[PDB]
């Protein structure tokens, strides 16, 4: 009877909804035994195989469905989703556009198409396609939530209050109905969800990994219980997709080579191929062992490799970010598995034992936000390679074009040597700051900037225009190499005023919300002449910020945007600001380290989530407790005092300039030593027969 195959197919759909994927596969396949030319069953089966990570087998069954039924729009759209996951973006687009051509009223295909535009940087078209999807299917949580993030990205705050209400309502309903939430874990920090909901979102996303490893039917691994096979050395494995030109390497690329080889054996497992940068060269050369798991796409075979290396502590540096293979941690090839540095939040997952953090970022009273046990670094868990990558910013000089420390700035590895040749430099006490008077050399430097010249030569020294680094040395621009020339950086290069206070924030615009811009407006209104210096990320968000600001009483000329710059220029131009205003909703993490390395004080208000408390952890390690606000009033008052009491500003900027060197904040050698002490507490605890517990010392 035709009822037979139909009943099996429709029952399987129910089992899929309930999360019973294995039974759904069983039913789909029985349907195909009963009715071999069953297009719907081929496509539905392919959809659950995709969910199990069997992407080629899924593609085979999609193509079968379409061979049977050439106008089967469901199969085209589902197949597009599989090609998108295989990184075949053009193939995905061709499938989505064919599905919509077949059925213009196909809401799911419009939404899946929108996700391609979103990921491609075409946010206006993503918004248009998500809005078509919601018009066709008004109850559509994936489309609604991904539209909400598009609007977050461009700072469109139209009906933002009602938007947050519905987002929370959607998540509440999906969690209650045991479904995967449509908000991604890495985005949940941006919305007013409870901590329980954020951890539950994370746990549900981690459960997707289980569906992909269960099909491997691998038994549990036997784990080492001593250090005998490793000559007393603890074997640490760092797993990352980001050994290459990516901010995580800009933070920790020095740490593998700084481990003590008498007590530790370091294994780096790359989840990405070699991008040819010095970042990848350095870790490959400095780790005791480097393993390219991008050549081993099966998570079962890759986990076998980790286990065969005898890893004691395996470190997850991705969490829920691009490039992750958390399936490797779900298989538990190591007895101790810790989250570290790359992902600002909990995995929510049973297969992670620890999250490496600190008492400022994650005070014990908020342990319930995390599924992991807390493992405290003694100062901050954050670290940066700035001292190794940007030593040319350790010193600076200025030109006295009239004395300011941040209107016309020179930096250079050989800057002192250059200044020895100029007998008329003045040394100002505030280290010390040399001041070049308005002489012939200074006029030539100023003329280079105004004329837009690339570089000039004075007394044999190359003097470079800071806007032209990629034409001079592309590897210096990326941070792969230390710049060799003396670089000139000026407020005129960025359209900043020479006679007023500059407040900067160089974060993605999606970290700003209405509450934050209101607080910044309050500050600018209390500091005459001051401006706010923001990042075009993306540019299409600029007119939204300007409209909301002008609506809050700020003329347009009070807000100055700059394009995204190469890594080195981005850190170097932080020296032109007077003060950095950190985003309370989700702090600057890498960019907080960047402004502090330039000597620019950062004002912050720590929240409750991990991501909202990192900047205050950094400032505590640095030793500037006066930059940490307990509430919005304090945040505004601190920023206004820095912008109006210029003697106080000089004092605080001098503190940052000095303590970026003397504090532990950028000291990678000390960090590695402290990290090693923490690993050994974890190991001794385990070796004594104990399950993970808080390591808050």
């Amino acid at each position: 009877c035709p009822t037979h195959a139909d009943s099996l197919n429709n029952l399987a759909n129910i089992k899929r909804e309930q999360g019973n994927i294995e039974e759904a596969v069983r039913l789909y396949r029985k349907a195909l035994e009963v009715f071999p030319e069953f297009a719907a069953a081929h496509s539905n089966l392919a959809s659950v195989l995709q969910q199990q990570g069997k992407l080629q087998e899924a593609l085979m069954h999609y193509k079968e469905a379409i061979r049977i039924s050439p106008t089967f729009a469901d199969a085209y759209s589902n197949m597009g989703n599989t090609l998108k996951e295989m990184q075949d973006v053009q193939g995905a687009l061709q499938c989505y556009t064919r599905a919509i051509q077949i059925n213009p009223a196909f809401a799911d295909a419009h939404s899946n198409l929108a996700s391609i535009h979103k990921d491609s940087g075409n946010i206006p078209e993503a918004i248009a396609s998500y809005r078509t999807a919601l018009k066709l299917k008004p109850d559509f949580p994936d489309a609604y939530c991904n539209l909400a993030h598009c609007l977050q990205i461009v700072c469109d705050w139209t009906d933002y209050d009602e938007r947050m209400k519905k987002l929370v309502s959607i998540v509440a309903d999906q969690l209650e109905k045991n479904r995967l939430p449509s908000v991604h874990p890495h985005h949940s920090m941006l919305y007013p969800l409870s901590h329980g909901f954020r951890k539950a979102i994370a746990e549900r996303h981690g459960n997707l990994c289980l569906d992909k490893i269960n099909v491997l039917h691998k038994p549990p691994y036997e784990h080492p219980k001593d250090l005998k096979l490793s000559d007393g050395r603890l074997r640490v494995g760092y797993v990352s997709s980001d050994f290459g030109n990516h901010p995580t390497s800009h933070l920790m690329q020095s740490i593998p080579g700084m481990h003590n080889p008498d007590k530790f054996e370091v294994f780096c497992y790359a989840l990405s191929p070699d991008d040819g940068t010095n970042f990848r060269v350095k870790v490959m050369a400095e780790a005791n062992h480097f393993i390219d798991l991008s050549q081993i796409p099966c998570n079962g075979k890759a986990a076998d490799r980790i286990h065969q290396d005898g890893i004691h502590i395996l470190v997850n540096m991705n969490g829920y970010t691009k490039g992750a293979r958390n399936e490797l941690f779900a298989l538990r090839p190591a007895p101790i598995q810790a989250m570290w540095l790359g992902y600002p939040g909990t995995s929510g997952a049973l297969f992670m034992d620890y999250i490496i953090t600190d008492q400022e970022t994650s005070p014990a009273e908020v342990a319930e936000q995390y599924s992991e046990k807390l493992a405290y670094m003694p100062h901050t868990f954050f670290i940066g390679d700035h001292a190794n990558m940007f030593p040319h910013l350790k010193k600076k000089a200025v030109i006295d074009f009239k004395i300011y420390d941040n209107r016309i700035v020179l930096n250079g590895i050989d800057l002192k040597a250059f200044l020895d040749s100029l007998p008329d430099v003045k040394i100002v006490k505030m280290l010390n700051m040399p001041v070049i008077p308005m002489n012939t050399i200074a006029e030539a430097v100023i003329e280079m900037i105004n004329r837009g010249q690339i570089q000039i030569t004075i007394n044999g020294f190359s003097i470079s225009n800071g806007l032209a680094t990629t034409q001079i040395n592309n590897k210096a621009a990326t941070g792969e190499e230390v710049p060799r020339t003396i670089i000139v950086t000026t407020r005129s290069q960025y359209g900043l005023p020479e006679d007023a206070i500059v407040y900067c924030n160089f974060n993605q615009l999606y970290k700003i919300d209405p509450s934050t811009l209101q607080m910044w407006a309050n500050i600018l209104k209390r500091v005459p002449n001051s401006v706010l210096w923001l990042l075009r990320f993306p540019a299409v968000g600029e007119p939204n910020i300007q409209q909301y600001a002008q609506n809050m009483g700020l003329p347009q000329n009070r807000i100055i945007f700059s394009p995204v710059a190469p890594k080195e220029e981005h850190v170097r131009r932080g020296q032109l600001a007077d003060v950095c205003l950190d985003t309370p909703l989700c702090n600057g993490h890498t960019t907080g380290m960047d402004v502090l390395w330039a000597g620019t004080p950062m004002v912050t208000m720590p929240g409750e989530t991990l991501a909202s408390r990192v900047a205050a952890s950094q400032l505590t390690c640095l030793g500037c407790l006066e930059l940490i606000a307990k509430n919005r009033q304090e945040y505004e008052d601190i920023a206004v005092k820095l912008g109006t009491d210029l003697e106080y500003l000089k004092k605080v900027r001098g503190k940052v300039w000095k303590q970026r060197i003397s504090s532990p904040l950028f000291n990678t050698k000390q960090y590695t030593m402290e990290l090693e002490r923490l690993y050994l507490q974890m190991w001794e605890h385990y070796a004594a027969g104990n399950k993970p517990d808080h390591m808050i010392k």
Binding site: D6, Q51, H186, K322
Partner: peptide, 14 residues
């Protein structure tokens, strides 16, 4: 930035 999730469609047999 991570890949934006997509929505699979389940086809009902009728």
């Amino acid at each position: 930035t991570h890949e934006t999730g997509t929505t699979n469609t389940a086809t009902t047999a009728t």
